[PDB]
Structure 1
Amino acid sequence: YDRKVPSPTGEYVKEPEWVLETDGVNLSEVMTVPGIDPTRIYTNSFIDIMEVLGIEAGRAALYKEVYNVIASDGSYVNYRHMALLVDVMTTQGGLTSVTRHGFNRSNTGALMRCSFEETVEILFEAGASAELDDCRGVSENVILGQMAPIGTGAFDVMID
C-alpha cells in the first residue's frame, strides 16, 4: 500500500508500506499479536468491529464501507447523507438493520410501522398491546390525509 505521510521538512511525501491482506476474520486474536500496529488494523466486517472495538468504532467502520461502494462506481455523495443513514442504524445501541425485522420493530408508532412490511400483523399486536399513536409521523398523517409536519407543516400560522 502506498501512503503519503509527513516528511521532517513538513511537506507530505509518499512512504510505501507493506500491508497484509487476509481471507478471514477474527479480530479478538489477530490484533493481540507482536509486530503489527493494533491501533489501525482494519476489517471490512463492521459487525466484528462493533462488538470488539466498541459501537462508536463500528459507526466509522460502517460509513467507510458505504463510501467504498459508492467510490468504486466512481460516484460521489455528500457526507451528511450516508452519515445520517449510519447514525440511524447505530443510535439504537447495536446494529439496527434497515429491514422488516430490524428498524421496523421499534416503538415508532403503528401506522408508520404498518406501512412498510408485515402490515396486518403489526395492527394485531397493537390491538393487543393497546398502543397509542402520537400522529406526529409523516405516514400517520399521510394515511389520515392531514397536513403533516413537513417543512411548511412544522409550524402553525396565525395573525398578530
Structure 2
Amino acid sequence: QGIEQISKVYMHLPQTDNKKKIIITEDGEFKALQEWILETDGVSLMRVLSEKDVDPVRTTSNDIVEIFTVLGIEAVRKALERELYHVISFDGSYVNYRHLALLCDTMTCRGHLMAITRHGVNRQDTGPLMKCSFEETVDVLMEA
C-alpha cells in the first residue's frame, strides 16, 4: 500500500491557531476548529494530492524545487516567503516585510530558481569587470 517514498506518517490535532480550521459563522464571527492533520517523512506530492478525501488546496511540502516542478513559479515565491517568515519569527523576533518581499522577488526574477551561490551569480547579463572580481578573472577576460 501507499506511496513508495513516504516512510512514516504521524497524526495529531493541534491546539494553536496556526494549523486550526478558522471559519466565519452566520453572525460573521471568526471561530477556530481543531482538525486532524497528517505529517510525513518523505515527499512525492503530485500523487498525494491526487488521492481521495485529501484536501488538494491546503496541502503543501517544505521542499521548494518540488513546488517549482509541480505548482509553478509564483508558488515558489510565496512558499519561500512563508518559510523565511517562519524561520525568522521562531524565537519571537520580528523583521519588516519589505525586506522579505524584495529578497524573495530578486531571487526568482529571471524565471527559474537561481541560488545565491557561486554558479548562480556566475549567470546573468552582467559586465566583464564584475566576473573578474570573482576567481576567474583571466579566462573570462580573455573570452571578452
Q: Return the TM-score normalized by structure 2.
A: 0.79
In 2: Cα distance, 1:24 partner to 1:85 partner: 28
Q: Which runs of 5+ in 2 are unaligned?
A: 1-18
Q: Which runs of 5+ in 1 are unaligned?
A: 131-160
Q: Does 1:127 align with 2:142?
A: yes
How many residues are aligned here? 126
User: Residues 66-116 of structure 1: CA distance to partner in whole angstroms, max 9, x if unpaired?
Assistant: 11110112211111101111111211111110111113322222333344x
Structure 1 counterpart of 2:40, which letter? T
State the shift of 1:122 in Å: 4.3
Map 1:2-21 → 2, pairs under 5 A? 2-21=20-39
RMSD, matched Cα: 1.6
Structure 2 counterpart of 1:89, which letter? M
- Is contact 2:107-2:113 (8 Å) kept? yes
State the shift of 1:124 in Å: 1.9
Three-state SS of the structure 1 residue aligned to 2:128 is coil
Name the counterpart of 2:75: 57
**Relative contact order higher in (CA < 8 Å, ≥ 6 apart):** 2
Which of 76, 89, 108 does residue 94 from structure 2 map onto? 76
Identity %: 48
Q: Return the TM-score normalized by structure 1.
A: 0.72
